[PDB]
Amino acid sequence: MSAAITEYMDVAQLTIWAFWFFFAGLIIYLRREDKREGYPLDSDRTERSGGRVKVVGFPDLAEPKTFVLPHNAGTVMAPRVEAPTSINATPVAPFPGAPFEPNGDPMLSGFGPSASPDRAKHCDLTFEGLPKIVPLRVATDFSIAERDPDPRGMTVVGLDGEVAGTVSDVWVDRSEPQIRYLEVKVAAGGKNVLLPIGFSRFDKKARKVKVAAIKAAHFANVPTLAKPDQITLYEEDKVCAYYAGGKLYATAERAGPLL
Amino acid sequence: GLTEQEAQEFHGIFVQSMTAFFGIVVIAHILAWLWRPWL
Amino acid sequence: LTEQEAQEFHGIFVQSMTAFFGIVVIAHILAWLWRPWL
Amino acid sequence: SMTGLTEQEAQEFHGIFVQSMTAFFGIVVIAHILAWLWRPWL
Amino acid sequence: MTGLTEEEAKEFHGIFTQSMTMFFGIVIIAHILAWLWRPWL
Amino acid sequence: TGLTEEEAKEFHGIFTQSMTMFFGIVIIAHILAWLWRPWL
Amino acid sequence: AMLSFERKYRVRGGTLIGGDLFDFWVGPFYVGFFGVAGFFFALLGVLLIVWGATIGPNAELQTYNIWQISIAPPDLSYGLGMAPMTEGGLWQIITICAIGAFVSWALREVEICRKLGIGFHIPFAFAFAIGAYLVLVVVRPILMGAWGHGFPYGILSHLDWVSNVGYQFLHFHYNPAHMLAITFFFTNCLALSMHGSLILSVTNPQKGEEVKTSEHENTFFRDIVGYSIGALAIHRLGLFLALSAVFWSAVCIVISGPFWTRGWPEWWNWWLELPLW
Amino acid sequence: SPDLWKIWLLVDPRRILIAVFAFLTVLGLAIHMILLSTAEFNWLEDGVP
Amino acid sequence: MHKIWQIFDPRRTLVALFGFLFVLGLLIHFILLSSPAFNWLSG
Amino acid sequence: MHKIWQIFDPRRTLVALFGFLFVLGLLIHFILLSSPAFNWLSG
Amino acid sequence: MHKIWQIFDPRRTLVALFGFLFVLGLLIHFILLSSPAFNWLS
Amino acid sequence: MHKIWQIFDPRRTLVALFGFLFVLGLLIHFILLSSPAFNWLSG
Amino acid sequence: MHKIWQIFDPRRTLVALFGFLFVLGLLIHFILLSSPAFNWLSGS
Amino acid sequence: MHKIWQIFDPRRTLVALFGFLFVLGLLIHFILLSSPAFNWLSGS
Amino acid sequence: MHKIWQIFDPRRTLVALFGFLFVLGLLIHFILLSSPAFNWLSG
Amino acid sequence: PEYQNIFTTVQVRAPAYPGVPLPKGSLPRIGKPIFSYWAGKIGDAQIGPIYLGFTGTLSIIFGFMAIFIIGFNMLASVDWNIIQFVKHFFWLGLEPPAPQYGLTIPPLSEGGWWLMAGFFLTMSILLWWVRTYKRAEALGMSQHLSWAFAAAIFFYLSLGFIRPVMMGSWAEAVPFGIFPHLDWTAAFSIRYGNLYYNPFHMLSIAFLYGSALLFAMHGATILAVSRFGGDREIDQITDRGTAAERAAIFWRWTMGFNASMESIHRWAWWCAVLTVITAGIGILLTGTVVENWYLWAIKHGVAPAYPEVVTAVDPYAT
Ligand code: BCL
Ligand code: BCL
Ligand code: BCL
Ligand code: BCL
Ligand code: BCL
Ligand SMILES: CC[C@H]1c2cc3[nH]c4c(c3C)C(=O)[C@H](C(=O)OC)c4c3nc(cc4[nH]c(cc(n2)[C@@H]1C)c(C(C)=O)c4C)[C@@H](C)[C@@H]3CCC(=O)OC/C=C(\C)CCC[C@H](C)CCC[C@H](C)CCCC(C)C
Ligand SMILES: COC(C)(C)C/C=C/C(C)=C/C=C/C(C)=C/C=C/C(C)=C/C=C\C=C(C)\C=C\C=C(C)\C=C\C=C(C)\C=C\CC(C)(C)OC
Ligand SMILES: CCCCCCCCCCCCO[C@@H]1O[C@H](CO)[C@@H](O[C@H]2O[C@H](CO)[C@@H](O)[C@H](O)[C@H]2O)[C@H](O)[C@H]1O
Ligand SMILES: [Ca+2]
Ligand SMILES: [Fe+3]
Ligand SMILES: [Mg+2]
């Protein structure tokens, strides 16, 4: 054997071409894996064709893979058929690609940044089968680190600076110990609502929790929990999505543009 | 997940295909040997 | 995973292993005739 | 009991393991005798 | 199944061949012209 | 699994004939190539 | 066409500039003001590169070979002024278009982030890559005093630039910031393989097993290296490693020539000449 | 073999049709590239005629 | 031709058309500026 | 052949066709300019 | 042509037009500066 | 031997085996081409 | 000895064995092709 | 001595042993090949 | 002695000791092979 | 500003998690777990426990022997002067055998120690690979990590063992030292005509660059949607939440296409793995089938040509 395959072809040239064929197959494989969610696409192409043309692009979809959930929570198929969901919005113009304007109060529309899918109405579970996100009042073995302030008792302040409530309890993740939610006693109504840690900016000196997402008045409409001591995956999405809607809807100037 | 009866049929065809593929291979190696022996 | 499958596997495994070894030996015998390495 | 094997089972494994080991050592010894005849290293 | 009716398959195949041979005929003429211009064999 | 038995037989009929047509054109091309520039 | 869950997210507003003028989608892409600006910045820059390839270094050497196409910066004698189009001026125009396209891409990402109500980590992270490019073609050439110090626009030609810039300091491996940046690049790749492996091995476990848990994830790397950073923190770490690699790479090149002209191994003479030894 | 047709009971015939056509196109392209790379069989840079 | 605006929406189409025309206009000027025989700024 | 518009969406076809033609026109002009035998701006 | 303002919002168009005009003016000045015969700072 | 297919899937084995044989054939052909004594594409 | 495959899965062990045997066979063939004394494709 | 198998699992001890012998065999073969007086692929 | 197995696990001790002995045995053989005076694989 | 989720503001403490129970007969995990406040600021506070089994013990013993041999030879290279050891530490190295020794075992200070350090380090790395395989197996997990590690080991073996054996020279291998192995890296590229023109070096860089690009993309993406629980990616894979949807929608709007919460980790896995796969291939091709990579690039029309503004009379052409 030798390095020269022909007068021009050599082993290194063959090796690099061999990689291109493998890499092409790898990209096709990866794109097919990418398409296990959200495909076939929601398209006008399908709509005018009466559903006779499924928009998948290239490569086409893969055969459904099986996710067996722990604790007999069920089995999900990664490529799955999903029922169409109506949107609480209307197009701002009739051309394709035009955005939609939410209907009613945008913070309550469940559209745009306030939209969320309906997840399972079951709590995420620890390896031992207990609910994962729970208040500190039921996860008695958990505690706040000594060097960090206790969130409980802190004043919750909305985006406008007005006081929204106080922190009654802290919800922790029992698998990876960390704060995920802050239970707020709303100043107006008194009904407890959850506040995700991702929307909470701590002011350690002032003992204040600043929520730039929504105003103090918006806290009254935060989606509530069925059971007081646990939260389902469905409820988690509903709560987080509501605060996210405030990043665009809470104040009129947040819609933009800047100039 | 494949039962025994369809296993009996598969092996017969596979052996026939392997024997057919082997036979072409043997002729090609004979022709290659006549063209340019390597050993 | 039971006895009537595991024992059945070993039997065919033996005569398939011996077939490979028999071909391997003939290949090595011919290789010795062509070019002894020792 | 750190493995979970009874006295019979450890003895039973040791009976075959020694036989398999001894045969391996038998072929190894023949290989080394043949290797020495081909080219002694000492 | 591709969502097509069985009569659509007959009808598509006929038009597919007509467009394919028409394309092939232009190609053959092009190669005859190209061969007369500069033969490669 | 999927395709039934009768259409499996029928598929082979067009598969075998179309492949044979491809093979025959290949043989003709290789006969022409050998006359053009033999390689052995 | 949108994802089957996407329609409920295609909201009006959230633009930085333009309001409703360009607030629409073209196929999958969001356009906005900076989609229009970015696209035609890129389109012009791409066409000028093709035009730069059409005339080449000269008519004799002109090539459309994708490896060999090269739009070169001006000669150093042109300083920080503008060069004639065929003498590096085209490179200067393409660089401006590239900056326009890259920044518009980042700003379009900001508008998308506002629409979706997510953090601005992605455009912030992309700014580091833009900053590295700006260091290479703007900050460093200005510090050196000539636009000709920028790298040529060519798939292989800019490797010759990297090679020769490195050998302008006789052994570029000894650049301390370069060593730090490579360490971050190598660690990031290791962390990425680890994170990709752990997620895949947990959600695609052995056959006959259910999907594993976050407890398995922590246990696995505790069992291997005695520490688990956590599901959230691995993404902090991956972002930190990638951003630190680019930051230190930008530092390493901007000190190579503007703030250090000697061979890089000689820089370590401060340590060798410590009076302790 | 009187039962070669049974290959189409286990694997989807549509996938084979595209795979065979894609594979043959690649194989045909590769062989042409190999021959062009040879001075002996390059029909574009041989001077004949 | 007027049905085309029932196929291509004026808002998105006009944005694409004007930018493509402007980029095309820029490219041709740049091509001429790069051509010594037609560089009107050469003096 | 008017039935091609019952299988292919005319809007997407026209977008793909107009885009390909514009790129093709640029490509052919660029090739000619790269050949000194056909660069019409050389004098 | 007054109807173009029913397609494109005027207050948004003015900002886009200002940026386009400024960016075009910047480019032309730079192109002139790249030409020695018209570089006014030589 | 006929009872092998109980564990090994007939379908995935064929594509795996055909793919293996194909790249094996490429490798052997390419090794011979790299050998001047067996390259059939030279003079 | 008839008690070997009650623990090792027939499918897994053959898959691991077949891959290993091919690699060893490939390696040995390549070593011999690399040794001028046993290269059978070199011309002599 | 038979009771060593109550402190080491045969399956885990067997696979570790098969790999260990394979590596050891490769190591010794490579050492001999790397030693010019014992390389059997030199032909002399 | 006999109590050394009361504060040391037999499993951890044995694998560690055999590991050191195997590494030590390899190291000594390597050193002897490195020494020209004791390389037994020479002439 | 809004909480960027870069640092944990308020940390939570629970009893140390022993870890998911291992299969019966396995050794217990060692180390009493402790909590580090600063580790918990950026990540998890818990440090330990670790599983140190039979395989890990052998890897450590083999690894220390290799590391001790390297450090001893570095100390010997400065004639036992520990002060000069510290001064020159970055420059010190265990250097591979000289070219005239081929593949034979040279005397201790002429490459013999290097071979032992190379062998012992290789054994420890191989044993560590078995440990990563066993740890995944003991938890019922797939072997993605051990495959990715094997790819890195393939590159490592190509550098120090496979390429030197294919070239028949231990002198081709990498010195055990900080600056010495950087000198090797530069000299390798110089010796074989500018490794920039090795296409697999080009590919390795594209994947190394892509690894940083993807982790920056994915790391920023997860942090951007961590306000929706995007960090809990198992949940988002089995039960797609708004975090995965917004993550995918962001990237679809940005670049026209997107991954899924699971498939992004397949892109990540392959990008990192291909970095060392193509690196190994590029090394194995260099000096064996290609002598001068730049000249190989010229032959295949990869290297650009520049106008001749500077040139040298070749003194050998006299
Ligand atoms: C090197 C010496 C000769 C030469 C020697 C040979 C030899 C020998 C062969 C070819 C073959 C081919 N050559 Mg030639 N060929 C040369 C130069 C060229 C040039 C060129 C511009 O220089 C081109 C474009 C081609 C092109 C071709 C293809 C037509 C064909 C392989 C296509 C294929 O992979 O089918 C695979 C892909 C498919 C989709 C096949 C489909 C099979 C169907 C079912 C059968 C009926 C076809 C049906 C109508 C579908 C249309 C597809 C047609 C193949 C177009 N050759 C030089 C001049 N060439 C091969 C051939 O004849 O194949 C037909 C062949 O054996
Ligand atoms: C001068 C150089 C001489 C040479 C001189 C010596 C001298 C002197 C010694 C050896 C020893 C050994 N030589 Mg020597 N040896 C040479 C060439 C070789 C070659 C070769 C291919 O050239 C090989 C493969 C060997 C191999 C060996 C081993 C069999 C042995 C080291 C084992 C060990 O380290 O255990 C450590 C690793 C372990 C895991 C130990 C635990 C063993 C098992 C697990 C416990 C079982 C208990 C059992 C019931 C009791 C019997 C113990 C048995 C060893 C099994 N030698 C050259 C020719 N060799 C040593 C020896 O004889 O040890 C037995 C020794 O003292
Ligand atoms: C030796 C070099 C010769 C040359 C020799 C040849 C040869 C030989 C051939 C061509 C062919 C082509 N040449 Mg020429 N050609 C030369 C120089 C040029 C120059 C130039 C600037 O110099 C250009 C722009 C072209 C361009 C072309 C294209 C028109 C055509 C390839 C089309 C294609 O790929 O369709 C592929 C893509 C499609 C078909 C998709 C389009 C779908 C259409 C719309 C289907 C409609 C259905 C319709 C009713 C039926 C089919 C009819 C046909 C499509 C017309 N040639 C030089 C002078 N050329 C080929 C040809 O004639 O093809 C027709 C061909 O065989
Ligand atoms: C080299 C020799 C000549 C030359 C030889 C040729 C030849 C030969 C041709 C051209 C053609 C063109 N030349 Mg010329 N051309 C030269 C120099 C130039 C220069 C220059 C600055 O030097 C420019 C700017 C041009 C520009 C042009 C374009 C007007 C045209 C390509 C259009 C196209 O690709 O549409 C494709 C893009 C689209 C279709 C997208 C547009 C989408 C729009 C919204 C829809 C329009 C479709 C409409 C309904 C129907 C189209 C036709 C209508 C009746 C107008 N040429 C040199 C001097 N040129 C071609 C032509 O005449 O085409 C008509 C052509 O065949
Ligand atoms: C070096 C000297 C000779 C040469 C010597 C040899 C020798 C010796 C051999 C080949 C073989 C092959 N050669 Mg040759 N060959 C040369 C040059 C070439 C050139 C070229 C352009 O130069 C090409 C394209 C080929 C091509 C080929 C292939 C047709 C074949 C390898 C196929 C394969 O890898 O199977 C892998 C892919 C598969 C196995 C997929 C399965 C495909 C088949 C159709 C399976 C069907 C099973 C069965 C037949 C089904 C029907 C059963 C009945 C219905 C009962 N050779 C030179 C000129 N060649 C080999 C061969 O003959 O194989 C057939 C072989 O042994
Ligand atoms: C900072 C950490 C890493 C990083 C991060 C990062 N990159 C990013 C992002 C982030 C967070 C994005 O959000 C953004 C994106 O959307 O990615 C999909 C992006 C992106 N990073 C990209 C590439 C990229 N990133 C790189 C590096 C990195 N990116 C870092 C290692 C590299 C390297 C190392 O080479 C490349 C090539 C794009 C895929 C994308 C930005 C796309 C963009 O800006 O689109 C607009 C522009 C065009 C479509 C074309 C513009 C063309 C010009 C007008 C002309 C050409 C000019 C250019 C100088 C030519 C040079 C060519 C030669 C060098 C060959
Ligand atoms: C606690 O430790 C103490 C203090 C006691 C000693 C510590 C000393 C220190 C601080 C040492 C520091 C060492 C450093 C900094 C080392 C740096 C090493 C680097 C950067 C290495 C980089 C690359 C090296 C590579 C890639 C080497 C690869 C070598 C291989 C793969 C060689 C394999 C060789 C084999 C398998 C040999 C085979 C031959 C057989 C037959 C054994 O030979 C007889
Ligand atoms: C380029 C990337 C984006 C950055 C944007 C800014 C680009 C450059 C800013 C424009 C500055 C132009 O400034 C102008 O430059 C040219 C070219 O050097 C100078 O020209 C001067 O030097 C050049 C070469 O050095 C000589 O050929 C010329 O004789 C002399 O007059 C002009 O005296 C100066 O007026
Ligand atoms: Ca010819
Ligand atoms: Fe992740
Ligand atoms: Mg050295």
mmCIF file of N, CA, C and O in Angstrom, chain P residues 262-282:
data_model
loop_
_atom_site.group_PDB
_atom_site.id
_atom_site.type_symbol
_atom_site.label_atom_id
_atom_site.label_comp_id
_atom_site.label_asym_id
_atom_site.label_seq_id
_atom_site.Cartn_x
_atom_site.Cartn_y
_atom_site.Cartn_z
ATOM 1 N N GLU P 262 -33.865 18.001 24.039
ATOM 2 C CA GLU P 262 -32.976 16.848 24.027
ATOM 3 C C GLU P 262 -31.963 16.902 22.891
ATOM 4 O O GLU P 262 -30.784 16.598 23.101
ATOM 5 N N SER P 263 -32.396 17.285 21.690
ATOM 6 C CA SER P 263 -31.514 17.214 20.533
ATOM 7 C C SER P 263 -30.388 18.235 20.593
ATOM 8 O O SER P 263 -29.335 18.002 19.991
ATOM 9 N N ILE P 264 -30.574 19.347 21.308
ATOM 10 C CA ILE P 264 -29.477 20.294 21.481
ATOM 11 C C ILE P 264 -28.305 19.616 22.175
ATOM 12 O O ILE P 264 -27.143 19.925 21.895
ATOM 13 N N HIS P 265 -28.588 18.659 23.058
ATOM 14 C CA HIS P 265 -27.522 17.936 23.733
ATOM 15 C C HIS P 265 -26.882 16.895 22.823
ATOM 16 O O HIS P 265 -25.746 16.483 23.069
ATOM 17 N N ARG P 266 -27.584 16.465 21.773
ATOM 18 C CA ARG P 266 -26.950 15.633 20.755
ATOM 19 C C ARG P 266 -26.033 16.462 19.862
ATOM 20 O O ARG P 266 -24.944 16.009 19.496
ATOM 21 N N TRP P 267 -26.459 17.675 19.499
ATOM 22 C CA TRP P 267 -25.565 18.592 18.800
ATOM 23 C C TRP P 267 -24.330 18.877 19.642
ATOM 24 O O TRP P 267 -23.203 18.884 19.138
ATOM 25 N N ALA P 268 -24.534 19.121 20.937
ATOM 26 C CA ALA P 268 -23.425 19.401 21.839
ATOM 27 C C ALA P 268 -22.494 18.203 21.954
ATOM 28 O O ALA P 268 -21.269 18.346 21.902
ATOM 29 N N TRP P 269 -23.065 17.009 22.115
ATOM 30 C CA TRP P 269 -22.247 15.814 22.270
ATOM 31 C C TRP P 269 -21.374 15.586 21.044
ATOM 32 O O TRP P 269 -20.169 15.344 21.162
ATOM 33 N N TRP P 270 -21.965 15.689 19.854
ATOM 34 C CA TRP P 270 -21.224 15.392 18.636
ATOM 35 C C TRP P 270 -20.191 16.467 18.329
ATOM 36 O O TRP P 270 -19.100 16.157 17.842
ATOM 37 N N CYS P 271 -20.512 17.732 18.602
ATOM 38 C CA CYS P 271 -19.562 18.804 18.333
ATOM 39 C C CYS P 271 -18.292 18.628 19.154
ATOM 40 O O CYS P 271 -17.178 18.745 18.633
ATOM 41 N N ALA P 272 -18.442 18.325 20.444
ATOM 42 C CA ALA P 272 -17.277 18.113 21.293
ATOM 43 C C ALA P 272 -16.538 16.837 20.910
ATOM 44 O O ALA P 272 -15.304 16.822 20.843
ATOM 45 N N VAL P 273 -17.278 15.759 20.638
ATOM 46 C CA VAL P 273 -16.653 14.486 20.292
ATOM 47 C C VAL P 273 -15.886 14.594 18.979
ATOM 48 O O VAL P 273 -14.770 14.081 18.853
ATOM 49 N N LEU P 274 -16.472 15.254 17.980
ATOM 50 C CA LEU P 274 -15.811 15.367 16.687
ATOM 51 C C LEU P 274 -14.542 16.201 16.769
ATOM 52 O O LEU P 274 -13.665 16.072 15.911
ATOM 53 N N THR P 275 -14.424 17.053 17.789
ATOM 54 C CA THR P 275 -13.203 17.823 17.987
ATOM 55 C C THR P 275 -12.001 16.901 18.150
ATOM 56 O O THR P 275 -10.950 17.112 17.539
ATOM 57 N N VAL P 276 -12.147 15.852 18.962
ATOM 58 C CA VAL P 276 -11.013 14.965 19.202
ATOM 59 C C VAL P 276 -10.961 13.853 18.165
ATOM 60 O O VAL P 276 -9.892 13.286 17.916
ATOM 61 N N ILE P 277 -12.097 13.515 17.554
ATOM 62 C CA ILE P 277 -12.095 12.494 16.508
ATOM 63 C C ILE P 277 -11.300 12.976 15.303
ATOM 64 O O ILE P 277 -10.410 12.282 14.803
ATOM 65 N N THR P 278 -11.605 14.183 14.826
ATOM 66 C CA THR P 278 -10.879 14.723 13.684
ATOM 67 C C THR P 278 -9.458 15.113 14.065
ATOM 68 O O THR P 278 -8.554 15.029 13.229
ATOM 69 N N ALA P 279 -9.244 15.527 15.315
ATOM 70 C CA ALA P 279 -7.888 15.786 15.788
ATOM 71 C C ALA P 279 -7.040 14.524 15.721
ATOM 72 O O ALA P 279 -5.892 14.557 15.266
ATOM 73 N N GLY P 280 -7.594 13.397 16.169
ATOM 74 C CA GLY P 280 -6.864 12.146 16.082
ATOM 75 C C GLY P 280 -6.570 11.744 14.650
ATOM 76 O O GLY P 280 -5.452 11.337 14.328
ATOM 77 N N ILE P 281 -7.563 11.874 13.768
ATOM 78 C CA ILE P 281 -7.374 11.515 12.365
ATOM 79 C C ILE P 281 -6.310 12.401 11.730
ATOM 80 O O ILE P 281 -5.420 11.922 11.018
ATOM 81 N N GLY P 282 -6.381 13.709 11.987
ATOM 82 C CA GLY P 282 -5.398 14.619 11.422
ATOM 83 C C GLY P 282 -3.983 14.298 11.859
ATOM 84 O O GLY P 282 -3.047 14.365 11.060
#
